Ligand binder design. Structure first.
Ligand SMILES: O=S(=O)(O)OC[C@@H]1O[C@@H](O[C@@H]2[C@@H](O)[C@H](O)O[C@H](CO)[C@@H]2O)[C@@H](O)[C@H](O)[C@@H]1O
Ligand SMILES: [Ca+2]
Ligand code: NA
Length: 507
């Protein structure tokens, strides 16, 4: 069967109505939700490394970051590591890649590609330029075309145009359809400027209240690093915030945070609307063409994002809003339609599961395993009850310390080792646009554990690591985290300073 893998950029699960967050009363994704009403909504899908390039590498390879070597936004994915597309080409599929690529190297293993180029692979919201192999008289990365209009509209037209005029109608196709929205700074199409103009976006209480959240690793001893760690919505963080970026000055510091939250969320949801409106045009074409009944469709985001919760922004954090990815699959031949699923899955599991759903076998060389049996009503054999996470990009871009962690259905334990893996990067500025105006440095940050009871406290408001009545859960989770790190091979032999910190904190 055909496969269309749709992925959006920073489209987090709270901003999708089918996940029923406090934002769901705004009805932000009516078309995505309709697809979910005829498919499976995976409630426990998680990123292993919440940034675009590492997450997109885990999806393509089905392997953890330390195995594909794409640790941060600074690394490249080898052309020979394009396992997902290659495995579909082996099965006789024609393959196409459209939209945001962000894997640095050429999508050479795709028969057709037309991917975003400018701004380090992030693209532009208006008149974006693409690198494509329909201009075959040039070579990567000089095979550039220009387009007219808004990126979400242009990208949707590229995919539909390929399906209509370039696709071989007698071969099954595997298409990766990647959007650039709703990425910052959320430059929505001008036709949405007054969408949600007179509607208040529901505000979480964690935006203003953070008592019990965090530790010395994320706030410092006696809250001395509240100005230093974690970019904010309020003017808490001294160097980067939405209140400062939006130049909001009410006189009341709390109303500053509120207005910056409204602006951040409305501009963001305006981009989400543009994606959702475009998907109606794509889904209408697939239905009219008759591909709706023989095409497996996936909607996901490369990672989640903090939408102001705990006065945080962006991703990278292991916190559930950034760690969890939205993941909706419609298998038109499965009886699992209009249901939710609680299975703990990862983005590294996407590739082998999609290979088996298309009539293949889960590749042995991948860390991820197939959960295709879910679409047959079965629980996969010996499936994990825990997930591994690691953010490597210490301090850079958003002043977020590197950390590892493990998450079960009931508990989450985070270990911040607060150090960058590259010694040459230690000591250097974290934000390049403030290299002149005084940015923070990629320095060592306090090492500490954070522990959250996901059944009593799913919003992760209360760190209960120092709590004595959780000290048995604490020792238990520290054991599973050490063996999970051991089982996946992320033992940091390559990095001595980091190995000593993690090994000594676990033992
Ligand atoms: O692609 S994402 O992971 O969804 O976004 C990550 C972004 O990282 C920083 O933006 C930098 C730019 O400052 C730099 O010029 O180019 C690189 C190209 O990868 C990134 O775009 C953050 O400043 C941004 O907020 C975002 O988190
Ligand atoms: Ca992203
Ligand atoms: Na887009």
């Amino acid at each position: 069967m055909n496969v269309i893998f749709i992925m959006s950029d920073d489209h987090t699960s709270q901003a999708i109505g089918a996940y029923g967050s406090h934002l769901a009363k705004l009805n932000p994704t009516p078309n995505i939700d309709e697809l979910a009403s005829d498919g499976v909504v995976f409630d426990n899908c998680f990123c292993t490394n919440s940034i675009s390039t590492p997450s997109r590498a885990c999806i393509m390879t089905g392997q953890y970051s330390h195995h594909n070597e794409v640790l941060t936004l600074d690394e490249k994915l080898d052309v020979d590591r394009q396992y997902l597309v290659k495995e579909f080409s082996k099965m006789g599929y024609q393959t196409a890649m459209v939209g945001k690529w962000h894997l640095k190297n050429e999508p050479a293993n795709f028969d057709y590609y037309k991917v975003l180029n400018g701004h380090g692979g992030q693209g532009e919201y208006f008149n974006p330029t693409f690198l494509t192999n329909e201009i075959s008289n040039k070579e990567w990365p000089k095979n550039q075309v220009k387009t007219n209009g808004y990126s979400s509209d242009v990208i949707t037209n590229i995919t539909i145009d390929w399906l209509k005029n370039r696709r071989d109608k007698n071969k099954p196709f595997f298409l990766m359809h990647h959007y650039k929205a709703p990425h910052d700074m959320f430059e929505y199409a001008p036709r949405y400027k007054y969408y949600l103009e007179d509607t208040e976006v529901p505000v979480p209480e964690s935006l203003y209240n953070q008592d019990g959240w965090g530790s010395e690793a994320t706030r410092g001893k006696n809250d001395s690093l509240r100005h230093f760690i974690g970019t904010s919505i309020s003017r808490r963080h001294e160097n980067r915030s939405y209140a400062e970026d939006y130049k909001i000055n009410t006189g009341d510091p709390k109303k500053d945070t509120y207005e910056a939250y409204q602006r951040y969320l409305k501009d963001y949801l305006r981009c989400v609307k543009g994606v959702d409106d475009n998907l109606k045009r794509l889904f209408d074409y697939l239905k009219k063409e008759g591909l709706w009944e023989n095409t497996i469709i996936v909607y996901t985001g490369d990672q989640g994002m903090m939408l102001g919760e705990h006065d945080l922004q962006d991703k990278r954090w292991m916190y559930d809003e950034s760690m969890r990815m939205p993941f909706i699959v419609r298998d038109p031949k499965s009886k699992q339609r209009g249901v939710h699923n609680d299975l703990m899955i990862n983005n590294i599991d996407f590739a082998p599961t999609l290979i088996e759903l298309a009539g293949g076998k889960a590749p042995k060389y991948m860390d991820g395993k197939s959960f295709a049996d879910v679409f047959e009503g079965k629980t996969p054999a010996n499936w994990k009850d825990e997930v591994y996470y690691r953010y490597w990009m210490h301090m850079i871009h958003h002043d977020i310390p590197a950390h590892i962690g493990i998450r079960t259905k009931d508990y989450k334990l985070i270990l911040f080792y607060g150090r960058h893996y590259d010694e040459k990067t230690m000591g250097t500025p974290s934000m390049w646009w403030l290299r002149d105006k005084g940015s923070h440095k990629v320095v060592q940050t306090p090492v500490a554990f954070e522990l959250y009871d996901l059944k009593k406290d799913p919003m992760e408001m209360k760190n209960v690591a120092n709590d004595p009545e959780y000290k048995d859960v604490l020792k238990d989770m520290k054991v599973r985290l050490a063996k999970l790190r051991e089982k996946v091979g992320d033992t940091d032999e390559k990095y001595p300073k980091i190995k000593a910190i993690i090994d000594n904190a676990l033992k």
